[PDB]
Write a protein that binds this ligand. Sequence first.
Ligand SMILES: [Mg+2]
Ligand SMILES: [Mg+2]
Lengths: 416, 416
Amino acid sequence: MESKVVVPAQGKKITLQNGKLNVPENPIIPYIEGDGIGVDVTPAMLKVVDAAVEKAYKGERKISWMEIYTGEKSTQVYGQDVWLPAETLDLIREYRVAIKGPLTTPVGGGIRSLNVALRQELDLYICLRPVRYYQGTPSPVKHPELTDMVIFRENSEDIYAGIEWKADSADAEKVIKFLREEMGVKKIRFPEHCGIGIKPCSEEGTKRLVRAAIEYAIANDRDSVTLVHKGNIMKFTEGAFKDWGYQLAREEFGGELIDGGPWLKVKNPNTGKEIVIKDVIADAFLQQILLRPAEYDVIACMNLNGDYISDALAAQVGGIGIAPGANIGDECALFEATHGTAPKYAGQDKVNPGSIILSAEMMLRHMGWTEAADLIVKGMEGAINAKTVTYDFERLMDGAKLLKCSEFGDAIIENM
Amino acid sequence: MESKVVVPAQGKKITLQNGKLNVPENPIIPYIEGDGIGVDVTPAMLKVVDAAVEKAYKGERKISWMEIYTGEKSTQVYGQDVWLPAETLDLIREYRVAIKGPLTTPVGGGIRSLNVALRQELDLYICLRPVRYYQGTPSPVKHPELTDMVIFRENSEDIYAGIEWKADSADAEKVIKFLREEMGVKKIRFPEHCGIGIKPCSEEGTKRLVRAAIEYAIANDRDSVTLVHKGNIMKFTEGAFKDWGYQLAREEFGGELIDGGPWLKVKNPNTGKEIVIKDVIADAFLQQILLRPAEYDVIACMNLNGDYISDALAAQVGGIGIAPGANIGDECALFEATHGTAPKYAGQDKVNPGSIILSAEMMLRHMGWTEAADLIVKGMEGAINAKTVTYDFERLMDGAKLLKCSEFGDAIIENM
Ligand SMILES: [Mg+2]
Ligand SMILES: [Mg+2]
């Protein structure tokens, strides 16, 4: 079968030279519509982004959107069982920057998360999830405005590697035999009818993630980088991550001991600000983000903890449905709606397009088109403050004007 | 060296017959003082518990406390490097019910968590952490009163098994070689300078935990049991836990499909109430406890997720320092202060003894001395409502009378 992707007539491919993006005034940007409500949120995103771009650069710049496939629609386009075409992986890497709506993975076919598949296949080792409060957002906590963090979640290793064997399977038995007999393992409480999973954490995987986190704090003049881990129980994976992260701060960024330790100060080479590098045990951290959110800023953590932390933080600022996210690697980046596919509402034009729209904001910023990105943030802030919102917000507040998904995209534009 | 434990002259040992505790009117109860602030909170607990017992049973019953050791004090008593004497394990199992202050594990000697050691050595497979709101407690959320859950955290397996090898170690290389060469593993992103951890989840470990959770919901007429897991990524450990938990509900408790699934209804054989058995993915759950706390009740989950969930829930109800906890097995039980040792305040009589006191409440209830247990809850409720509290609470409120740790124990008694 031939590619069903149509490369835009007008439009030029973004290139990368010396680790820096070279973006034309007419970049071709691949986008995956997304399953379920992607059908509602993606069009709203396309419209909002084009407006921000038009408004910021007076027509001098324009994105040439190119639809690519993954998920249910992909099976619809490329046929039964083509959930993630090789061409989509090729195209994202080729065009450098892309965006996607939500995706779901089918059950019953032994297929692993398509979202994780994209991340791992493309080596997008940074899952970047910034979490801030938008004034006017109905929140479950008393002071959501104190929350302004940026999560750098390691995206290529940890238990997400997908290395595991089913209880009673011959492989699981093989692995357990090896562990008990050759490794001398005596700690498996119940070796029978036992599932086994492997959790890897490497020096290189950890340092490239933390390096990106510290560079981000420097580039954005943030106040601190917190290494979140459960190293007191998992000494060689989680504790190693913490150790390697502080070691990198010291080796590459001149981090030096604060008082008697364990924290370090890294001087911002551009503002002279001293960035604090510290660490918090993961369970305690889930308490600290609620109790002393003002003390945290950039967070660097492993894959699973980051999955939990980003979800917990989004919920607390009332942002469960408008949380932006990006998956960034050294050769390309994939921005994404971070919520689910909500099939019950799909096609109804009712869900909140705020998440994919703020992911588009991150995308534009990544492309260096910061004026367009600032217009989207400004639009999002005014629409929400205007209390002209979608049902998920409206139902939690008084005096709100209920808007459809499409209408909220307009409201964002009306507020740029 | 001879035991330094002194068995109480008066006092009788609790026995177990047919899985049911036989508690004398003069039970001997072992207690570990605890490191750091254990020095402050344990005496307050001893006094409060004796008062509740005296008041409820008019002198007919009385606990004969027996001090046993673990932690820093143990090295002080039994000598260098005796952090957890074998006799403490023997005594807890022998006397069936015990309580402990906080403990910390030394770093630099390759010693694993002493708290986890106790749990695993004694096969206390249930970590029971109930979380409710006490009116008057300063909380970070708007509606903490909506939170009333009971966490059944699996305590014997998961990554807590302590099976791992250090990056670059010969064993780690040995394990990785085996994985790639004999198991055909290709998913380790960076096989060099790579730490490896093993995560086991068995049918028997999962079912005994979930069985206890469902029996608790029945015995206490709770509304539902939620299986929390990240089975969409960890199919054979976390997904297996979810599958085995629903299977047990069906096989042993007559659970039957609700609507089209996946939830089940289990009829309370004593109240005829239908208990809902459902499940939520772990990251989403950390959002749900904040956003729709009223929809959750008894929670059954694996070791690590339970560590996170219990911490997150305690923080949200303003209970970070008064959260009770118990470690229960088939032959004995160990109740515990659930906070840290806070050495900076140790010996100052200033920290909140509420956690170990509410763990003592759970202890008394476990012994079937529910009247005494109800007196402690009543005392805790009146002291907190009276705004006569320790600094950790007082500093967060207006119009509070600041009390020392010892004085707050009195306030609890004054309110029984
Ligand atoms: Mg997630
Ligand atoms: Mg914990």
